[PDB]
Amino acid sequence: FVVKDIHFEGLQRVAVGAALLSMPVRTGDTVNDEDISNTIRALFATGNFEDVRVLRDGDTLLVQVKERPTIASITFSGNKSVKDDMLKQNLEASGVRVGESLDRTTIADIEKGLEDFYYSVGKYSASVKAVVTPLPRNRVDLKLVFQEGVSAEIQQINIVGNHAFTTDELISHFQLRDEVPWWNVVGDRKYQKQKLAGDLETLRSYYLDRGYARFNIDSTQVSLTPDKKGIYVTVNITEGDQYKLSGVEVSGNLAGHSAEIEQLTKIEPGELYNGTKVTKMEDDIKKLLGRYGYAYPRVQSMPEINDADKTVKLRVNVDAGNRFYVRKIRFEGNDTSKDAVLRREMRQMEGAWLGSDLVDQGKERLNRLGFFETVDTDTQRVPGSPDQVDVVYKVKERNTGSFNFGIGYGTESGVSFQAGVQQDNWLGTGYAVGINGTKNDYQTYAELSVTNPYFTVDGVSLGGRLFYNDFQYTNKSYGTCVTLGFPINEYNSLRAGLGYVHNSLSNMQPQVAMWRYLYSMGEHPSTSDQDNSFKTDDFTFNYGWTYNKLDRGYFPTDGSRVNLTGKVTIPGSDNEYYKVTLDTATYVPIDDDHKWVVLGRTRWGYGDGLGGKEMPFYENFYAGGSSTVRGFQSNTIGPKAVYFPHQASNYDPDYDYECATQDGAKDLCKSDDAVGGNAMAVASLEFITPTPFISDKYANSVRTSFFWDMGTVWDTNWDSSQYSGYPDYSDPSNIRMSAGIALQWMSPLGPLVFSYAQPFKKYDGDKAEQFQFNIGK
Amino acid sequence: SRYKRQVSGDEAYLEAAPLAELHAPAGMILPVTSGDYAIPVTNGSGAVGKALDIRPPAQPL
């Protein structure tokens, strides 16, 4: 038989010609019902529909397909334990391509696939139901809906065959947990498959670090309870024996450096074997080769374990390879940022030997910009060269700027208005511009600031700032400064600058510590009534220094920090004075492991007039509160004012009663309100010891200490002789001390600080605040 | 969208400086060209700049 024509109707998804070319036998071929059935199989292989009718009644064949809704829209009823994008991408990867094809068999498949996914995440109780409805033009809409219990609690993790260490010490280092105590209840019994495997690697590493070189995790299994809501984890250990390390022998094509490689691998023959020791030792070897430019060394460490005695010798094989040169650096994704803004701060040098530590130090320094969400990196060899590498950094531009506006209200407070605009990386120039501005019923403030962190290509930052700061004692002030800050060493920053500030003090209450200054300035104000002003212009040279080699950065264990700042006015200022600050923190460990530490912090300040003028009272030093000595109200430690009686005072006697209200006092009021001194000397000695409740999962994060504080502030030219009746503020010996406890906690909501302090040594008027709280000190 | 200055079509890519190949002095030759190569001159009647109708062809199918 021969077929002369083929009939089709519909063809909604696929044209007749595409079917005929897909079919094995075609118009004009010799065919029989077996061949026609093979064409129907070809229709099924392309996958239109399974329901068909076929008729032969002549030299032409008729075939019809029963087209049925297949072109599916997908929706899910929400998802209380998986993310929407993960759900949809799992669905699409599982196979339900939106608008491709969908069938009752595929609906069963996707149900089971999502079920098995849900079981893979660990909500083994979960159920998935999928329903479809049909739509004109062969379309369907598919909804699937989920039910689940709480994901199963792991019961007792148990280790078996162990004898060197107790089971509770082994599982306590797991990230899976048997128990969550009454405290730190943030822990959870969530099984994770990938974390269980990591916990086996932690168990293996612990035994190798304890020196059981023969150790083997011979087997493990996990089990689920019948009600499908609880999990057991069991691990089998073969411990072998504890081993002693014999001296390392190093061999292979070391391209020199062999004397340093020797020094790096010398180990005394009495030490235990240790897994992290060999891996740390191997890592130094390849990093040492890297530093000299052998960017891709080959190194292997092989343990020669003995059985006749408990000794093992490490064999380390090294070859240096080629001395790769960085023939290109590229930055990709560096939209909206000047390239020099990256190249200037990335550290590895193009056209030079590849220090792989220098490439990674670049990656760190780019992150310290904060301009980028992530700094990915690659190094790739140029095709057709054995010897040369292109370094590439790939960055995601973080949205660096911020813009803010706001308003406030309340009859007891008045109108409030606030604004702000910040943009680190201004137009990508790497300048940091920042404007602020605030108004209330009384205060006005505005600030404009610019820093150019590379005024000179070596990293000399230059800054510039303007401020207006207007308050109502009434004080309108405004000014400027410009600064240069340039590092002199890795540990040792230095900076300098010039400033200008104007001050317009007015209606300040008459008091000795302030009037002494005004008389020294050659102003002779009234003492009897609160009507005065003292305008001045001032020009200053500002300097500072910062030594900082603190090891850990977060909670340093060892090292020291020393900040210094100072001011002199320059001739032409109305004020003529100088001031100096020294501000230090030394850490020294008092155990060989850095478990126990003691601090000594100190602050020293000083200032004086020059040329017979006097230091302006608004620059006076203050002490007390969390920053300085604990257990005293913030700043209240200095000498307290004594007001002159000025019964022509502020308007209303119904307010909180002033010194010399309209009906008030008539002598010098020894105040309860603190004023700073021109001199300052604070110390604290602080012992760090771990809590009774540590475990190493968090003992690094709850820095607890016992401290002794010692503070004073004094007013070096308060002429005690003339004021016989009032306590001597010129006496530096009024040292006031406190002790207490402190607890520094890094938990997610912030670097909290808790403290309680007892002022075992204080004087009249020192407002005590024993319990204190702070963040981020 | 940030590109709003660009997709509305600037003229500013015109009057870019014309290309001019360097000529070597005697006793040397310039490096051999290795990429991003000189485009064939292909001068013709095609429109340029804002005269070019960026829309899809006069019949879309």
Binding site: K80, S125, A126, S127, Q147, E148, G149, V150, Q155, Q156, N158, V160, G161, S219, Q221, V222, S223, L224, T225, P226, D227, G230, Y232, T234, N236 | -
Partner: protein, 356 residues
């Protein structure tokens, strides 16, 4: 800071008048119990003495008529995780542990006879036959031990899934040959004297389908079943599948009067006819409420709840018939089919003797 969810919505405690007044005759507290830790620690009987233990390690022997204990030993260092059914034969009580120990105790005074490490935790109850103790461990190893010494005579290894139900599958013996279950759906048998392998059979497709349940053997027919698997009957001589049912099972089953009594994964109870997977009756009542092993006592099938109740079901009729007291924190391990008696241990460490 917290949230919770649920799926199965278990049955709302169907209940009926306690017609036969079944009630505790006596009860004793041995100590703590298994608590939340699913583990087949259950008491056992010999010569009118009932023996019971606390998963912490403490073990007692009690008189069955009145419940006063005669022993106390710790089995522990100065917890043992003592775990697995107490088994008793003649001079010796045998107990497993989740710490790879098997303990033997003297039935005359409760002194520790001997202790030997087995390959992994012995979640199976020990079983004594032919003068040997057989233990099945979670590492998939049958081990046969000398009853006077615990010395291993032979050992046999089985395939372990990457995820299982608890691998108890305690062995059984007939004609001097052992039969055992296992994970990954394997039935197997071995020669008791030497551990030679006999035929093995794959119960079903596998997705968990562990044959976690002890296979009973009667007249040469082995019955075996699995979680989401199939119940099957097997020729002890050849392992030919006599018949199957698509009914799975989850904890235990019993053959008595050549009739099959089951607990489905849906905590429903049914009896199946002599051969072929067809039900005489189904009690669909207790759905998704964890049921203990059903015990046939004095013509009534007794099953314990996850909570305090004991439910009484007719031996051949499709009737649910009685509901005893709400015993303390309910049950999670199999009662013992003692002759003319009942003994069941609650989750908390309270043991109960029941009469009607």
């Amino acid at each position: 800071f917290n949230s919770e969810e649920d799926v199965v919505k278990m049955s709302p405690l169907p209940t009926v008048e306690n017609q036969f007044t079944p009630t505790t005759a006596w009860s004793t507290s041995v100590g703590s119990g298994i608590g939340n830790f699913y583990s087949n620690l259950h008491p056992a009987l010999a010569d009118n003495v009932v023996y019971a233990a606390d998963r912490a390690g403490l073990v007692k022997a009690l008189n069955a008529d009145d419940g006063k204990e005669i022993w106390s030993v710790s089995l522990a260092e100065k917890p043992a995780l003592l775990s697995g059914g107490v088994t008793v034969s003649g001079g010796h009580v045998y107990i497993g542990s989740e710490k790879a120990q098997v303990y033997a105790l003297n039935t005359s005074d409760g002194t520790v006879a001997w202790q030997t490490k087995v390959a992994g935790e012995a979640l199976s109850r020990p079983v004594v036959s032919d003068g040997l103790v057989l233990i099945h461990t979670s590492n998939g190893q049958l081990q046969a031990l000398n009853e006077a010494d615990g010395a291993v005579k032979w050992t046999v290894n089985l395939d372990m899934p990457s995820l299982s139900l608890r691998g108890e599958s305690a062995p059984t013996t007939a004609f001097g040959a052992a039969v055992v279950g296992g994970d990954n759906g394997r039935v197997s048998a071995v020669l008791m004297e030497q551990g030679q392998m006999i035929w093995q059979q794959r119960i079903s497709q596998a997705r968990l389908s562990d044959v976690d349940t002890t296979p009973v053997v009667v007249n040469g027919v082995v019955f075996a079943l699995a979680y989401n698997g199939n119940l099957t009957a097997l020729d002890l001589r050849s392992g030919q599948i006599m018949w199957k049912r698509e009914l799975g099972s989850v904890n235990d089953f019993i053959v008595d009067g050549n009739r099959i009594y089951l607990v489905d994964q849906n905590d429903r109870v049914m009896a199946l006819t002599i051969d072929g997977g067809v039900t005489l009756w189904t009690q669909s009542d207790l759905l998704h409420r964890l049921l203990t092993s059903p015990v046939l006592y004095n013509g009534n099938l007794v099953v314990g709840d996850s909570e305090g109740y004991l439910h009484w079901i007719n031996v051949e009729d499709g009737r649910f018939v009685a509901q005893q007291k709400v015993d303390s924190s309910g049950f999670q391990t199999e009662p013992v089919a003692a002759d003319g008696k009942l003994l069941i241990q609650a989750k908390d460490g309270t043991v109960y003797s029941i009469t009607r």
